[PDB]
């Protein structure tokens, strides 16, 4: 797993990692209406998926393989899209705080911190955009904000339990549109 | 004060921040043989030098202003070229580690850590290349590797520490890495 840090894959004024852009655009072109996108295990193992993530047109690949490589990408990032410091703070507030809008405002504040490269917020924004576009064809792909949140929150925060429930809902709301 | 983090100013495959490249290339074009480069102050204050670090061709400026803007840039980076995490560990090393080669090995390992974006090490390498290029015209600019280390180590590490055998070691490694490029 040689995948560089998000901050090493691109920098402003670019808006997202170029590899993540290729994956998202190919997946959206080929699987926007696939009733099982992101919920089916393809036949490829991590080593094969990583070969795809190390270099040519991703549209040539099976859409279920692209979906698995997307997940592999989020898993292999040296640091998760939502850094551990941010997740740790949100989780330790879990019993004391229960306002979703407060969690959302705090997540935004924490992830835009000066100590955290801007690329993390930018990538999160790009992923939320992708997840939201999928939810607009939910009647066909069955991926609504809630399902998308349950699938990807563990990859974005990098957790496998009851504390997590607050994090999942945050993503669900942010997918559906919010601050 | 508004200078973005090194990790936000560029990313691979670029090798250094574009602004730093402009400064270095202009300084090398106009001052490679200047015998007081980096050793005299220009008349501009920090606010004016920061003004320059936004926006034109930098070759248009007085070379002594460019040299001061170069220093201003290193000082205004939100985190120094050599992050404090690295400096703290290096300064903490015991006297039994008397080997410059060991300090260098640890600097590379610590600064290449996944917790530190590759841009910091890349920027340091670009600066060392510049410092090495200067030391090769020492017969005219009077700049050797050691003096360049003594001048710029406080800007690269940005570390208030009392002079010790640890501080001497960090200056020494920078000296070695300049002459080794």
Residue numbers in the entry:
A (entry chain B): 113 to 167, 172 to 276, 280 to 298
B (entry chain A): 113 to 167, 172 to 297
Paper text:
The N-terminal domains of p85α include an SH3 domain, capable of binding to proline-rich sequences, and a BH (breakpoint cluster region homology) domain. The BH domain can bind to and regulate several GTPases including Rab5, Rac1 and Cdc42. In addition, the p85α BH domain, either alone or together with the SH3 domain, can bind to and positively regulate PTEN activity. The p85α BH domain also exhibits Rab5 GAP activity to stimulate Rab5-mediated GTP hydrolysis required to inactivate Rab5-mediated protein trafficking functions.
